[PDB]
Structure 1
Amino acid sequence: LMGGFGLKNPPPQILIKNTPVPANPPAEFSATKFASFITQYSTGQVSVEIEWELQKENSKRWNPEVQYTSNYAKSANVDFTVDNNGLYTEPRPIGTRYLTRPL
């Protein structure tokens, strides 16, 4: 109901954690397991590559259709670019229903 593709077997969840590396244990044994760990974190890169199957229009409409254009005007800030201090902003939501076809 939010829109999208309903999938019985969706893309599976990729779960990730840091392996716990404990600090120094005491000299004698104690079975109350571990509260002392080495405070750490990880970083890295992650790349996702989805292939999408397109469906071409077969339209026999005569007149021009409605497009998603950018307003060519004297603007202070370009749409869908970064700001004066590098904040990336998205000025409006873009749907996907622009082309037409008969019912």
Structure 2
Amino acid sequence: PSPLMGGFGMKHPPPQILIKNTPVPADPPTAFNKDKLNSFITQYSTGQVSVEIEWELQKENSKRWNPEIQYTSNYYKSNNVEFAVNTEGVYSEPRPIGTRYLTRNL
């Protein structure tokens, strides 16, 4: 049951976290009306969110003699730095990076 787009398949994954601004009615009429209130004060909210994940690693103990292939940046000069902001403040990811650079036997 490994997910086909990649990753870890779990029967009990991290739960969904749901959030909502509590409605605040505007001034109701001074005579009773049984219909649900339709007039509300315009509101929004802001805040900080933190997520901390501990990951377990599995180290390599290869006996390969020659050097491996490694992900690296290229020294050649360019207008911008890869994985940084440009002059207008926009961050970008210039390429997809996988995980398979070290090698193992079958």
Please state which band the TM-score falls in when normalised by the shorter chain. over 0.9
Distance across 1 between alignment mates of 2:61 and 2:87: 43
Pairing of 1:6-85 with structure 2 (within 5 A): 6-85=9-88
**Which of residues 92, 95, 98 is equivalent to 2:101?**
98
Question: How many residues of Structure 1 are paired with residues of Structure 2 in the alignment?
Answer: 103
Distance across 1 between alignment mates of 2:41 and 2:88: 36
Distance across 2 between alignment mates of 1:35 and 1:86: 41
Deviation at residue 82 of structure 1 after TM alignment: 0.4
* Length-normalised TM-score, structure 2: 0.96
Aligned alpha-carbon RMSD (Å): 0.5
Give ranges in structure 1 of 5+ residues lacking alignment.
none
Distance across 1 between alignment mates of 2:38 and 2:90: 40
Cα deviations by residue, 1:23-48 (Å, 9 ceiling, x for unpaired)? 00000110111110100000000000
Distance across 2 between alignment mates of 1:72 and 1:84: 20
The ranges of structure 1 where at least 4 consecutive aligned residues each deviate by more than 2 angstroms after the TM superposition are none
Deviation at residue 58 of structure 1 after TM alignment: 1.1
Specify which structure has the bigger relative contact order, considering alpha-carbon pairs within 8 angstroms and separated by 6 or more residues.
1
* Length-normalised TM-score, structure 1: 0.98
Instruction: State percent identity of aligned pairs.
Output: 80
Deviation at residue 21 of structure 1 after TM alignment: 0.5
**One-letter amino acid of the structure 1 residue matched with residue 19 of structure 2:** I
